[PDB]
Amino acid sequence: DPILLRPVDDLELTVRSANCLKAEAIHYIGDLVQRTEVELLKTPNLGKKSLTEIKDVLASRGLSLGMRLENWPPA
DNA sequence: TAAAATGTGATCTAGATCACATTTTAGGCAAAAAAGGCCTTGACATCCCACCTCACGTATGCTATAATGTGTGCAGTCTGACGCGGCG
């Protein structure tokens, strides 16, 4: 999709969550959605609420978590 | 009357029982500490400011044989009515 290929700062993320993302080598939103929730919760600084509001904003702009890709990355 | 429903009963078969010890694990209550929010510090980078700053540019002065009344390239004349100043 045209929205697979965006950096996450178009979502206007937060500093703690941003540190969580850059800390975990998660580059593309296609790389985001291929990651699973429990693969996030165990990670540093990602407990209750990061998952809450990131779930909110992805509920806003029409996508969800944990989805599955194929032919990734086209780069 | 064709075609589906109805008795033989002994031999079995996957789950329930049933009192009590031990985990766990919440969930939710107290919180340690870390990472934003708050500020600071040092260090850099880029300046704004202006403060100068010399070359090039510019405002001004004389030049002693002598020379002395324009014109100068145009217009082509439209015309009928109305004011006004001479014009007798």
Side-chain angles (χ1 to χ4, degrees), chain A residues 3 8 11-12 21 29 32-33 35-37 40 50-67:
Chain A
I3 189 161
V8 70
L11 301 180
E12 200 274 326
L21 292 173
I29 290 171
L32 270 299
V33 303
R35 302 296 179 91
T36 306
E37 181 173 358
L40 302 170
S50 295
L51 190 283
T52 303
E53 279 79 1
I54 65 95
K55 188 75 177 70
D56 292 332
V57 70
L58 60 85
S60 67
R61 291 180 78 181
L63 302 172
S64 68
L65 297 173
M67 293 293 106

Side-chain angles (χ1 to χ4, degrees), chain A residues 5-33:
Chain A
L5 59 90
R6 293 180 182 275
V8 70
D9 197 2
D10 286 329
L11 301 180
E12 200 274 326
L13 75 164
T14 310
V15 181
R16 290 179 68 96
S17 65
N19 293 297
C20 298
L21 292 173
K22 68 183 74 172
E24 192 62 25
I26 292 165
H27 294 282
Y28 294 104
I29 290 171
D31 289 331
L32 270 299
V33 303

